[PDB]
Amino acid sequence: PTVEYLNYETLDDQGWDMDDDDLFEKAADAGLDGEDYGTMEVAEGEYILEAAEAQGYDWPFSCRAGACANCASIVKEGEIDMDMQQILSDEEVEEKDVRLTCIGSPAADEVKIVYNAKHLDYLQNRVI
Numbered sequence: 001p002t003v004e005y006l007n008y009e010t011l012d013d014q015g016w017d018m019d020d021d022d023l024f025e026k027a028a029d030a031g032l033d034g035e036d037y038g039t040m041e042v043a044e045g046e047y048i049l050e051a052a053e054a055q056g057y058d059w060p061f062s063c064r065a066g067a068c069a070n071c072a073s074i075v076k077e078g079e080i081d082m083d084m085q086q087i088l089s090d091e092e093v094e095e096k097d098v099r100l101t102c103i104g105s106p107a108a109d110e111v112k113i114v115y116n117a118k119h120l121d122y123l124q125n126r127v128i
């Protein structure tokens, strides 16, 4: 039950690559904020945003029922289990690797994922 969360905003701000500089690995040498990069440990049956929230990590959330994408993320690798529902578009689960962190649990041992997907330029336009 090991995972590595990464700040999607840090990837853009720094202007790094998605998997070229191996942020999940080079990040440990940057000592960035723990709320941006770190190894998230979650057992089977435990919600990510929940296991990380008990450590000090922060995640975007609004519906908290797996019916919206505010808590959207970007799994860079591994696999996560979802509930009986699918509000996101497979394109986001395959082209953006987005998942539900409020109601999503890791089904693999090691998994990579970026937290705070709301930073995506596709949503930033929602700003009023």
Ligand code: FES
Binding pocket: 060, 061, 062, 063, 064, 065, 066, 067, 068, 069, 070, 071, 072, 100, 101, 102, 103
């Ligand atoms: S907070 Fe709505 S799907 Fe996660």
